[PDB]
């Protein structure tokens, strides 16, 4: 962050059909992916045509890796000649606040971090077209951070079905029923997602984990006594049916067990790979919400004050 901040400028080409000029003025608060932090760019650099890969149109699941290679930025004010935006990885403004309009079906609460998702949901698929410049604009959907980790988990688990010759479409949040639009996924980026999983999957298994696996008979006995332990298993976990069959037991005795702590080493390696993995698939939750005149609910279709999240 500078003392004034850093504001990029996206210049507009001169050939403009006047209805497309009013279409840009409705893009007052959106999220824009910049490839660089160059000070002056073009709308052709921003739009979906340069946002494609070489010869291949990316799908929805493959579009996530294209996001984290680039720089999310937010349009501040639409001028007649250019569009002024502020990056997010760079310190955002002089004041520390940006307005963000919700192109999202779900309302927002205070303090919740915002990650951002491609246009995925049915019905609300809205892409602004600049037909004088023959451009297409696909703008991402800002969403709360546990919701974005659900949607990535729904898409990635869908692609693993495609490698194996029901059902997983329906989500829920605030009681709202909502499914998502997807037809195919390219076999390329799914392997890039899956290899990012299983390397982080393996790196949690350490010597203390087998000691933790001996507590599987304890939890299935403890879920009888407290309903809070019944809030774990949910009947859809493996570990409820895994405890019904396997009775594991501990290895003994560990090499150099006097000097070292095996249960401690398994947890810290778990916190750096598996608990990290919510960051590794999608992009980071850079932004949370701090309303100043206190509005507990930011409604769908309205702006919101915006402050960085560490």
């Amino acid at each position: 962050m500078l003392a004034d901040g850093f504001e990029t400028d996206i210049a507009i080409p001169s050939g403009i059909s006047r209805p497309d000029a009013a279409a840009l003025q409705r893009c007052e608060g959106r999220v824009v992916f910049l490839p660089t932090i160059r000070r002056q760019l073009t709308l052709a650099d921003v739009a979906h045509e340069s946002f494609v890969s070489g010869g291949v149109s990316p799908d929805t699941l493959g579009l996530l890796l294209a996001y984290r290679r680039r720089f999310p930025a937010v349009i501040t004010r639409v001028l007649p000649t250019r569009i002024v935006a502020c990056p997010l990885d760079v310190g955002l403004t002089h004041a520390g606040t940006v307005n963000l309009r919700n192109t999202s079906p779900v309302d927002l609460c205070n303090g919740d971090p915002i990650s951002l998702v491609p246009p995925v949901f049915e019905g609300q698929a809205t892409d602004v077209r600049l037909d004088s410049l023959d451009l297409t604009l696909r703008f991402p959907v800002p969403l709360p951070s546990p919701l974005a980790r659900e949607i990535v988990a729904r898409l990635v688990a869908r692609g693993i079905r495609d490698l194996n010759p029901p059902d997983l479409n329906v989500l829920y949040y605030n009681g709202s029923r909502l499914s998502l639009l997807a037809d195919v996924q390219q076999l390329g980026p799914v392997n890039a997602e899956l290899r990012s999983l299983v390397l982080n999957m393996v790196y949690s298994i350490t010597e203390g984990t087998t000691i933790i696996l001996t507590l599987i008979p304890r939890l299935f006995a403890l879920s009888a006594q407290d309903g809070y332990v019944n809030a774990l298993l949910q009947m859809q976990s493996v570990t409820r049916e895994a405890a019904q069959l396997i009775h594991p037991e501990a290895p003994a005795l560990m090499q150099d067990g006097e000097r070292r702590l095996p249960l401690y080493e398994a947890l810290v390696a778990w916190l750096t790979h598996a608990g990290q993995l919510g960051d590794t698939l999608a992009l980071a939750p850079v932004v949370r919400v701090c309303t100043f005149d206190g509005a507990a609910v930011v409604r769908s279709g309205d702006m919101a004050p915006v402050i960085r999240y560490p």
Partner: protein, 49 residues
């Protein structure tokens, strides 16, 4: 007397409550939209089926 009105005939089960008809209601078994629908892309047809 005047223009002669035309009745319709819709097949219905026998064992419905007559009490559904003693108040104003639909001939359809479910209340239609779109006044009843809220603010969502699906709600108007979602009330229906």
């Amino acid at each position: 007397h005047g223009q002669d009105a035309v009745c319709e005939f819709i097949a219905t089960p026998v064992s419905t409550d007559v009490n559904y008809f003693r108040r104003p209601c639909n001939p359809r078994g479910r209340a239609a939209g779109g006044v009843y629908a809220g603010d969502k892309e699906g709600d108007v047809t979602a009330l229906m089926y």
